[PDB]
Design a protein around this ligand. Structure first.
Ligand SMILES: CCCCCCCCCCCCCCCCCC(=O)OC[C@H](CO[C@@H]1O[C@H](CO[C@H]2O[C@H](CO)[C@H](O)[C@H](O)[C@H]2O)[C@H](O)[C@H](O)[C@H]1O)OC(=O)CCCCCCCCCCCCCCCCC
Ligand code: CLA
Ligand code: CLA
Ligand code: CLA
Ligand SMILES: CC(C)=CCC/C(C)=C/CC/C(C)=C/CC/C(C)=C/CC/C(C)=C/CC/C(C)=C/CC/C(C)=C/CC/C(C)=C/CC/C(C)=C/CC1=CC(=O)C(C)=C(C)C1=O
Ligand SMILES: CCCCCCCCCCCCCCCC(=O)OC[C@H](COP(=O)(O)OC[C@@H](O)CO)OC(=O)CCCCCCCCCCCCCCC
Ligand SMILES: CCCCCCCCCCCCCCCC(=O)OC[C@H](COP(=O)(O)OC[C@@H](O)CO)OC(=O)CCCCCCCCCCCCCCC
Ligand code: HEM
Ligand SMILES: CC1=C(/C=C/C(C)=C/C=C/C(C)=C/C=C/C=C(C)/C=C/C=C(C)/C=C/C2=C(C)CCCC2(C)C)C(C)(C)CCC1
Ligand SMILES: CC1=C(/C=C/C(C)=C/C=C/C(C)=C/C=C/C=C(C)/C=C/C=C(C)/C=C/C2=C(C)CCCC2(C)C)C(C)(C)CCC1
Ligand SMILES: CCCCCCCCCCCCO[C@@H]1O[C@H](CO)[C@@H](O[C@H]2O[C@H](CO)[C@@H](O)[C@H](O)[C@H]2O)[C@H](O)[C@H]1O
Ligand SMILES: CCCCCCCCCCCCO[C@@H]1O[C@H](CO)[C@@H](O[C@H]2O[C@H](CO)[C@@H](O)[C@H](O)[C@H]2O)[C@H](O)[C@H]1O
Ligand SMILES: CCCCCCCS[C@@H]1O[C@H](CO)[C@@H](O)[C@H](O)[C@H]1O
Ligand code: OEX
Ligand SMILES: [Ca+2]
Ligand SMILES: [Cl-]
Ligand SMILES: [Cl-]
Ligand SMILES: [Fe+2]
Lengths: 171, 30, 252, 137, 33, 97, 334, 37, 244, 36, 34
């Protein structure tokens, strides 16, 4: 992971960012749908522990789609109304995210990175007062590469004298 | 031009939220 | 810093005098009275509800205890608990100010790389404070530093002339026992090598109490929401023949 | 590679005599250096004054010379600045200041020797890492 | 800033082309019997 | 032409010896007997027109003068460089280990 | 009814298109203020001195950022944990220089998002639902508290809060790695298991329900038309799904109880994410990831690196480079 | 509640689409040189 | 009578110089056989003015008002030095040490931020000849040094610096270097400033004096990347004179 | 700034009073089932 | 040649916007019950 940050700036890559959205989006969907079903359950037994009040072979939905739908429509603005769509979307989102991150890694095989914004660099090269979080993270990347490469890439036989190592003040 | 573009896409997405909520197809028990 | 700022034992002892009397008066009160009408209508009256209220309260107390051990050095003496995070960072600035001043630096007029004083600068209200990143910690107060403070903050005359060997020692001790360390108790910054077996009691006590306070807030929500539902009679699910939403008008 | 009697042979004094420490003295020296010194001197540097380290070449150029057991043992009783000019027991752990540095209260003469031998043996093992700081981690 | 001059038209058609595809399909769905 | 004055100083004697007028004070650790007592006196009494002038600092003991004579061959002097002496940099130049 | 009574009835009405409720009376204005300030600051704010060293960082679109580089920049390290409302500044221009919008935003946001959570309990009560959706939302909420409030408290400054911006988020992550070795921390590891596993189980549940939809449609129509909102009958066959998944692995590793399955779907991501939040919130007090730096040593005493030591070198790169003009002393203690 | 009685369907026949596209494309072909200037 | 740190902390008073009563209109005798020092010189800026830079070059540029954005962090204080009595009876203050600089950022109409190192570093200031007492008619005028606002280790956002940092624009590996030389080669500025101190109040008995000052100096030039502006600072001062 | 402050203080107090009075206004009863 | 750098998007939108308006109208006329 840290190699991909320092060398590929892989956080900056919109294919990795879509991966993140589909992984975190899928974890969100997993949590919110499990919680919604568990909190719109029909009372189907007398027990205060409600798991036994379900039967695999039962015909009826175990929870109220209508109540769930009203709840999220009123809390968030929209809500699922179609259970087939809901479950298809749960496949689509994390699956699509993973496939997007894979495409970015195929570019990285070739060092075809989203490493830089050229407009940013042209401005920063001419203007030593211009600073963004994007320029800050490249300084971190340059430290990762210089500090880790000699031990991480032993076949290169790197020798970087103390005096060439990039460091800020004191540290 | 770039800033205009970013703000334009954002403002479209906000409008879209408005229509998706208040002008949704209503869910119908049927 | 609210109550966490308490900085002298007279205030601590006086507070407990008050609190002891408040609690005994309150207790007599509650033995002699029954809850009023407005309280009756505001709460849920069940074992599970009362538990929820106490979980809420313990959660709050947990977060406060976390901040108390993190910042307060009066009821958590640094002699026993180690330096606070703010304390140790200030002690580092004090250490190098002493070092470089012994070497001949004039530490009041030494301009650092950014233009701010390398050792000394002003807070946003003007008080003289240590410089570098510990600018954030200038509200720190501690017995080894206070002798250097004047009405306008750190006093340059006192710094140049009055720093005693016991202050140098204590600042060095605190700087090198800052509350930073790994889960397997390797003391120091995250890139430090194995050698020193140390994690500050302040970090142990703050982190444990944060975790506990957090899960107690969760238990508060869990039990408070459950007590509400049980009291109103739908904790086991929605009655299929009396589903409330089904008697409500459409949203659209 | 092994921790041999040769690696464990270090200068006793400035006059060419050596002492060969036992494996148990080497272990005691690591333990005691950790116990009393590593809070400031982890890895051979010095956290409260990084300009001075515990490298052997540095110790040799100290006054009096500190690159031998006797110089180090004497340092732990009566530490000086690097030029020998000031006695710093009041701000540096030592037997003379065991009153204000209570960790030094339990250290025996044998313990001082073990710590000294640690300071001299470790760079023979660790090379530039000893006294190198983070660059060499 | 020295941006890529084609980024404006690239962005505009990237939004317009599929958005118009969808609006076309939506409207002719609504207009069905 | 714009010049980096520190790089340029590295091609003078400043790049070869302890420059009594410019070098940061930790550099005196390199030689027996110079640090911290003499190092402090030297930086404090700088600049010097020539290396020997370091022998003229007031209050010096005889032993201190002798240590200075033995080390003159390790010293140089060059013009004071504002970039090296401002900021209290001769006492703390932001370099630790 | 009197005015108050009528107002209460409207506030708590189950018939408002968006539920208001008492939590909502605090949520609505605080979230609006946080949103409006964020939008304006993200577009038009001038550079902000985040590290208190008079080195302002440009976050806004009009000052040279794009969507990926832009942020609302944290308030000044000179401020620390001091409360910096607009009226503490001598002018808006000063307020902007010092990163006042960041505090206005994150404080209104954290208050409003806490009320969003209460509002989820509140509506579930009005509708006669079980009450714990809000306990699921406490996981992302707790994570937002960790990065915008608890971490700044532990470190002594809101300048160490996560920036409100895409690149600034990555900046916060890389610096967090340097300073706490979060990857080697088991609570972040549980977090990863929580979100990778949430994604895995999301896809798994999606695909199993989808695989067992009961035929109700023809091939020229979306199978989605096979389900009608509010129908009483389940729309897939759980018995075929379990029949499938119990054979994929083995019978007893598959859920045959939908309530059990759904509870697991709720619990796995929520608990992992609570541990992620707690990792951030305890590294806030510098109890850090496992440190095996030089843990493996040969018979002589030579260090034999492991992958932990290679991590350590990457971390050193981050540490020595971050905030390259802010440190004057050798240790980064907060 | 009750639907709006004022609504009407709208039409554009194929010939008008072709006429309209011809107008737009020919106007573009004419004005584009001035747009690029 | 006297305020403690707890009385002052967070009020703004720590950035203020001491004032003297309207009653303080006395005269402080100078014995030319005695040596003297200033034990505490304090300068509290109340206005920063920046000289606008016209395209016109016809008609003179004015100094315009600006808004302080770095808060109550502007005063110079605890400064000390020798007060020499010269052979013509003029006094010369030779600044030795103290909190003798503050980085300050002020903002012009329209948003341009002007950082400067507000300072009296190495101040040498002198009165009129024959000053046999310091009175409300004494003034001091002199010059000081204005070093680069950033010191030599300062690294720009691309990692470039004078005593540290890259020496080129490493993000544009094959750009022609000539157009970037001014940004790539950092330079350390050192210029002179001027100040007048105008005594308005003197306590004969305590050796304390207070007045108004005005100084003029250049602002930050970003290690030679751009031209500095001319700044004029006005405010109040306090000094305590002592036999020493 | 002083007017802004007072204005926000009044605004915040207003909404906080709504929240506290609102929850005091027979909240347990506002559910679809058992109101007592 | 030094052309106006907005001519490209002006011509493209000039074409696209009203053409799309007509195509929308045409297609939903065809799809009407008929
Ligand atoms: C496979 C693992 C996963 C399996 C799932 C099971 C779930 C539970 C996980 C339990 C893991 C078992 C390991 C137990 C061994 C252990 O701990 O071993 C450690 C010690 C015993 O070992 C000793 O541990 C010591 C720890 O240092 C301590 O002692 C030192 C020497 O005096 C210093 O004083 C130092 O400052 C101080 O921290 C030293 O390293 C000693 O050399 C070593 O012998 O056990 C102790 O401490 C006892 C532990 C007491 C409870 C800790 C409560 C405080 C936690 C705060 C909560 C914060 C959140 C945590 C984030 C995670
Ligand atoms: C918000 C934080 C976040 C999130 C959610 C992600 C999310 C993701 N990251 Mg990214 N990452 C991050 C921050 C994050 N990242 C940061 C800050 C960096 C620094 C640059 C990275 C650097 C990084 C790299 C370098 C990579 C990712 C990748 C990924 C993807 C991994 C998908 C996966 O599960 O692979 C897990 C593996 C699989 C799904 C393969 C199949 C596994 C089989 C089925 C296992 C079977 C196991 C078997 C049964 C037995 C096990 C036995 C047991 C003993 C263990 C996913 C989109 C990866 C990606 O893009 O790949 C295309 C990747 O290479 N990230
Ligand atoms: C464990 C301690 C404890 C507990 C659980 C209770 C519980 C109760 N008390 Mg007792 N009480 C106590 C200790 C306690 N009391 C003590 C020590 C005293 C003496 C001071 C009292 C004196 C007392 C009186 C005089 C009354 C009660 C009443 C009640 C009932 C209603 C409480 C209520 O509505 O609070 C909720 C609090 C409010 C509605 C006040 C306004 C809420 C504001 C917004 C809170 C602001 C604080 C905020 C959270 C921040 C914290 C820091 C802050 C200090 C700045 C309930 C049975 C009432 C009653 O029915 O008596 C029979 C009543 O009239 N109590
Ligand atoms: C629900 C409405 C609401 C709330 C809760 C807040 C809250 C906040 N505002 Mg925002 N604000 C709002 C609406 C709100 N705002 C609107 C509509 C505007 C546009 C006019 C603003 C404009 C605004 C600005 C311009 C700023 C704020 C700021 C603040 C913060 C400080 C407020 C303060 O000092 O109050 C102090 C007032 C009190 C403490 C009064 C409380 C009195 C009661 C009777 C006592 C009980 C309260 C006690 C603490 C316990 C809580 C009770 C609980 C147990 C139920 C805080 C995050 C400042 C900021 O963000 O700083 C970084 C800031 O600069 N607000
Ligand atoms: C001023 C300016 C310009 C401001 C903007 C600044 C700024 C920083 C803007 C952000 C820019 C931005 C958004 C960046 C992110 C871009 C990005 C990475 C996009 C990813 C794009 C992409 C195609 C990724 C591929 C992977 C993928 C398909 C991800 C999709 C993720 C996704 C949308 C998941 C669902 C999220 C979500 C909240 C769902 C809610 C579902 C819901 C209503 C559940 C409730 C519910 C549950 C039940 O169980 C039941 C039964 C019912 C009934 C019910 O209802
Ligand atoms: C920590 C809490 C444990 C899980 C519950 C929290 C997840 C919430 C998800 C959102 C709401 C989801 C939701 O609505 O759940 C609902 C679900 C079923 O509701 P019931 O009403 O049937 O049962 C709960 C009570 O009413 C008593 O019967 O709750 C449970 O099953 C609780 C199980 C507790 C078991 C004891 C605690 C054991 C914890 C297990 C994890 C420990 C291992 C950790 C190692 C790292
Ligand atoms: C307190 C009040 C809070 C108000 C919050 C504002 C919320 C806006 C919520 C999304 C509205 C837009 C939905 C369009 C799409 C829409 O109308 O969906 C409505 C759709 C309804 O689903 P049904 O089951 O009814 O429909 C299925 C059948 O039609 C099959 O075709 O909902 C979903 O598909 C849920 C999953 C998508 C969830 C998307 C959530 C995305 C969050 C936003 C991410 C973008 C951020 C960009 C930032 C710059
Ligand atoms: C018993 C444990 C210790 C031992 C054996 C020890 C050893 C030494 C030695 C041999 C030197 C001289 C280095 C040289 O000449 O190159 C030295 C210097 C120094 N040590 Fe220690 N030390 C110990 C504990 C500590 C501790 C705990 C601290 C931090 C509080 C510390 C801080 C210092 C400092 C600041 C210097 C430089 C002093 C000066 O010359 O002004 N030492 N130490
Ligand atoms: C000891 C001490 C001290 C003192 C202390 C004190 C004096 C304390 C007090 C305390 C107190 C005096 C507290 C109070 C608290 C309160 C609270 C915590 C409240 C709560 C509330 C609630 C919870 C409510 C709720 C509700 C609402 C709001 C609405 C309606 C509904 C209901 C009812 C649910 C000092 C610091 C000096 C120092 C140190 C030591
Ligand atoms: C009444 C009521 C209600 C409603 C409410 C509301 C609707 C409110 C709103 C509110 C709002 C709506 C608010 C807002 C606020 C805002 C703010 C507070 C903002 C601020 C901003 C700023 C301050 C900015 C600044 C700037 C920047 C950042 C950059 C550029 C420059 C300038 C300066 C412009 C309810 C339903 C709940 C119920 C109860 C009663
Ligand atoms: C970027 C540029 C984009 C340009 C955007 C232009 C959008 C133009 C929108 C055109 C809308 C036409 O609007 C559409 O009218 C038709 C009839 O014409 C209505 O349709 C109605 O009449 C038809 C024909 O009798 C019936 O078969 C149908 O059931 C009935 O609903 C649709 O319900 C409505 O959606
Ligand atoms: C921080 C400042 C706030 C501190 C205030 C704390 C003081 C505690 C005592 C307050 C007493 C309030 O008393 C409470 O008032 C409300 C508002 O009229 C009452 O009135 C309410 O009753 C019913 C309850 O079924 C509601 O449907 C109705 O809308 C409402 O009028 C409550 O039934 C009464 O019990
Ligand atoms: C409706 C709110 C619009 C947001 C206004 C942005 C602040 S105002 C903006 O400030 C700039 C910097 O000082 C000026 O250069 C510019 O002339 C001015 O319009
Ligand atoms: O501010 Mn943001 O980051 Ca937490 O560590 Mn110290 O301070 Mn700064 O260095 Mn590393
Ligand atoms: Ca006068
Ligand atoms: Cl950084
Ligand atoms: Cl620092
Ligand atoms: Fe499901």
């Amino acid at each position: 992971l840290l190699f991909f940050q320092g060398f590929h700036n892989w956080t900056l890559n919109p294919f990795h960012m879509m991966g993140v959205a589909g992984v975190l989006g899928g974890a969100l969907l997993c949590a919110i749908h499990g919680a919604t079903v568990e909190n719109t359950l029909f009372q189907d037994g007398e027990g205060a522990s409600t798991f036994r009040a379900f039967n695999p072979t039962q015909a009826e939905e175990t929870y109220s789609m209508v109540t769930a739908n009203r709840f999220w429509s009123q809390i968030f603005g929209i809500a699922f109304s179609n259970k087939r769509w809901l479950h298809f979307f749960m496949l689509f989102v994390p699956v699509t995210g993973l496939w997007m991150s894979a495409i970015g890694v195929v570019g990285l095989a070739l060092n075809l990175r989203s490493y830089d914004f050229i407009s940013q660099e042209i401005r920063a090269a001419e203007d030593p007062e211009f600073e963004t979080f994007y320029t800050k993270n490249l300084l971190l990347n340059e430290g990762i590469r210089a500090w880790m490469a000699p031990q991480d890439q032993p076949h290169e036989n790197f020798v970087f004298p103390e005096e060439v190592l990039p460091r800020g003040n004191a540290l | 031009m770039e800033t205009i573009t970013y703000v334009f896409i954002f403002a479209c997405i906000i409008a879209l939220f408005f229509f998706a909520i208040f002008f949704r197809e209503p869910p119908r028990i049927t | 810093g609210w109550i966490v700022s308490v900085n002298n034992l007279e205030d601590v002892v006086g507070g407990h005098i008050w609190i002891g009397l408040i609690c005994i008066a309150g207790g007599i009160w509650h033995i002699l009275t029954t809850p009023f009408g407005w309280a009756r209508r505001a709460f849920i009256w069940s074992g599970e509800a009362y538990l929820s209220y106490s979980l809420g309260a313990l959660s709050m107390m947990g977060f406060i205890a976390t901040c108390f051990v993190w910042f307060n050095n009066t009821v958590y003496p640094s002699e026993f608990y180690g330096p606070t995070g703010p304390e140790a960072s200030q002690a580092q600035a004090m250490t190098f100010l002493i070092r470089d001043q012994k070497l001949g630096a004039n530490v009041g007029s030494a301009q650092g790389p950014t233009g701010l004083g390398k050792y000394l600068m002003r807070s946003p209200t003007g008080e003289i404070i240590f410089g570098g990143e510990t600018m954030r910690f200038w509200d720190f107060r501690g017995p080894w530093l206070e002798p250097l403070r004047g009405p306008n903050g750190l006093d340059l005359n006192k710094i140049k002339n009055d720093i005693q060997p016991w202050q140098e020692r204590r600042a060095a001790e605190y700087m090198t026992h800052a509350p930073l360390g790994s889960l397997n108790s390797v003391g120091g910054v995250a890139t430090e090598i194995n050698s020193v077996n140390f994690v500050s009691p302040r970090s142990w006590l703050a982190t444990s109490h944060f975790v506990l306070a957090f899960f107690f807030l969760v238990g508060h929500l869990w039990h408070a929401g459950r007590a509400r539902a049980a009291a109103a009679g739908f904790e086991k699910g929605i009655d299929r023949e009396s589903e409330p939403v089904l008697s409500m008008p459409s949203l659209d | 590679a092994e921790l041999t009697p040769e690696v464990l042979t270090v200068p006793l004094n400035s006059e060419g005599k050596t002492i060969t420490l036992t494996e148990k003295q080497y272990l005691e020296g690591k333990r005691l250096f950790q116990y009393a010194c590593a809070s400031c001197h982890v890895g051979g540097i010095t956290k409260t004054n990084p300009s001075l380290d515990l490298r052997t070449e540095t110790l040799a150029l100290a006054t009096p010379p500190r690159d031998n057991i006797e110089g180090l043992v004497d340092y732990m009783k009566n530490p000086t600045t690097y030029d020998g000019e000031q006695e710093i027991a009041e701000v540096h752990p030592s037997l003379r200041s065991a009153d204000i540095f209570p960790k030094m209260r339990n250290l025996t003469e044998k313990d001082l020797v073990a710590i000294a031998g640690h300071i001299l043996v470790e760079p023979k093992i660790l090379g530039d890492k000893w006294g190198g700081g983070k660059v060499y981690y | 800033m020295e941006v890529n001059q084609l980024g404006l038209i690239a962005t505009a058609l990237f939004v317009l082309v599929p958005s118009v595809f969808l609006i076309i399909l939506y409207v002719q769905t609504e207009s069905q019997q | 032409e714009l010049v980096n004055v520190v790089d340029e100083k590295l091609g003078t004697a400043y790049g070869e010896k302890i420059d009594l007028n410019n070098t940061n004070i930790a550099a005196f650790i390199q030689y027996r007997g110079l640090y911290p007592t003499l190092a402090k006196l030297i930086v404090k009494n700088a600049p010097y027109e020539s290396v020997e002038d370091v022998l003229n600092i007031p209050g010096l003991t005889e032993r201190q003068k002798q240590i200075l004579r033995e080390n003159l061959e390790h010293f140089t002097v060059t013009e004071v460089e504002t970039a090296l002496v401002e900021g209290g940099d001769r006492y703390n130049n932001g370099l630790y280990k | 009814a009197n005015l108050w009574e009528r107002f209460c009835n409207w506030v708590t009405s189950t018939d408002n298109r968006l539920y208001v409720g008492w939590f909502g009376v605090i949520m609505i204005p605080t979230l609006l203020a946080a949103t409006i300030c964020f939008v304006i600051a993200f577009i038009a704010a001038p550079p902000v001195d985040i590290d208190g060293i008079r080195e302002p960082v440009s976050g806004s679109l009009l000052y040279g950022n794009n969507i990926i580089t832009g942020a609302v920049v944290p308030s000044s390290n000179a401020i620390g944990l001091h409360f910096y409302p607009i009226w503490e500044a001598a002018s808006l221009d000063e307020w902007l220089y010092n990163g006042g919008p960041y505090q206005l935003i994150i404080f209104h946001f954290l208050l409003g998002a806490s009320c969003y959570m209460g509002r989820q309990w509140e509506l579930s009560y009005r509708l006669g639902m079980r009450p714990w959706i809000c306990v699921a939302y406490s996981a992302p909420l707790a994570s937002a508290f960790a990065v915008f409030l608890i971490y700044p408290i532990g470190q002594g400054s809101f300048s160490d809060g996560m920036p409100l911006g895409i690149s600034g988020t990555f900046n916060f992550m890389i610096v967090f790695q340097a300073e706490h070795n979060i990857l080697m921390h088991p609570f972040h590891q549980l977090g990863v298991a929580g979100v990778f596993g949430g994604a895995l189980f999301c896809a798994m549940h999606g695909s199993l329900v989808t695989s067992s939809l009961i035929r109700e449609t023809t091939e020229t129509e979306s199978a989605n038309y096979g389900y009608k909102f509010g129908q009483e009958e389940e729309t897939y066959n759980i018995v075929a799904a379990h029949g499938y998944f119990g054979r994929l692995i083995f019978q007893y590793a598959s859920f045959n109880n939908s309530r059990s399955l759904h509870f697991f779907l709720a619990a796995w991501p929520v608990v992992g994410v609570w541990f992620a939040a707690l990792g951030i919130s305890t590294m806030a007090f510098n109890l850090n990831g496992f440190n095996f730096n030089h843990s493996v040593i040969d018979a002589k005493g030579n260090v034999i690196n492991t992958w932990a030591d290679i991590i350590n070198r990457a971390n050193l790169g981050m540490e020595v480079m971050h905030e390259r003009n802010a440190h004057n002393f050798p240790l980064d203690l907060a | 509640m009750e639907p709006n009685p004022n609504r009407q369907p709208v039409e554009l026949n194929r010939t008008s689409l072709y006429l309209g596209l011809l107008l737009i494309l020919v106007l573009a072909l004419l004005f584009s040189s001035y747009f690029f200037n | 009578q006297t305020l403690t740190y707890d009385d002052i902390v967070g009020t703004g008073l720590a950035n203020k110089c001491p004032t003297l009563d309207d009653t303080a209109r006395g005269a402080y005798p100078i014995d030319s056989s005695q040596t003297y020092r200033i034990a505490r010189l304090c300068l509290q800026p109340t206005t920063f003015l920046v000289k606008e830079e016209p395209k016109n070059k016809r008609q003179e540029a004015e100094f315009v008002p600006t808004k302080l954005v770095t808060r109550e962090t502007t005063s110079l204080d605890q400064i000390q030095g020798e007060l020499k009595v010269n052979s013509d009876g003029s006094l010369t203050f030779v600044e030795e040490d103290g909190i003798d600089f503050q980085p300050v950022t002020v903002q012009m109409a329209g948003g341009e931020r002007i950082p400067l190192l507000f300072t009296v570093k190495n101040l040498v200031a002198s009165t009129q000849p024959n000053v046999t007492s310091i009175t409300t008619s004494t003034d001091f005028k002199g010059e000081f040094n204005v070093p680069s606002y950033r010191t030599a280790n300062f690294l720009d956002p691309k990692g470039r610096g004078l005593a540290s940092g890259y020496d080129s624009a490493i993000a544009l590996p094959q750009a022609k270097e000539e157009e970037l030389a001014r940004a790539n080669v950092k330079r350390f500025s050192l210029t002179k400033g001027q100040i007048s101190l105008n005594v308005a109040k003197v306590d004969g008995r305590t050796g304390e004096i207070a007045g108004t000052f005005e100084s003029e100096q250049l602002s930050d030039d970003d290690m030679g990347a751009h031209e500095p502006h001319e700044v004029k600072i006005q405010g109040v001062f306090y000094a305590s004179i002592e036999p020493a | 700034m002083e007017t802004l402050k007072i204005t926000v203080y009044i605004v915040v107090t207003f909404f906080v009073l709504l929240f506290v009075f609102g929850f005091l206004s027979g909240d347990p009863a506002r559910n679809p089932k058992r109101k007592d």
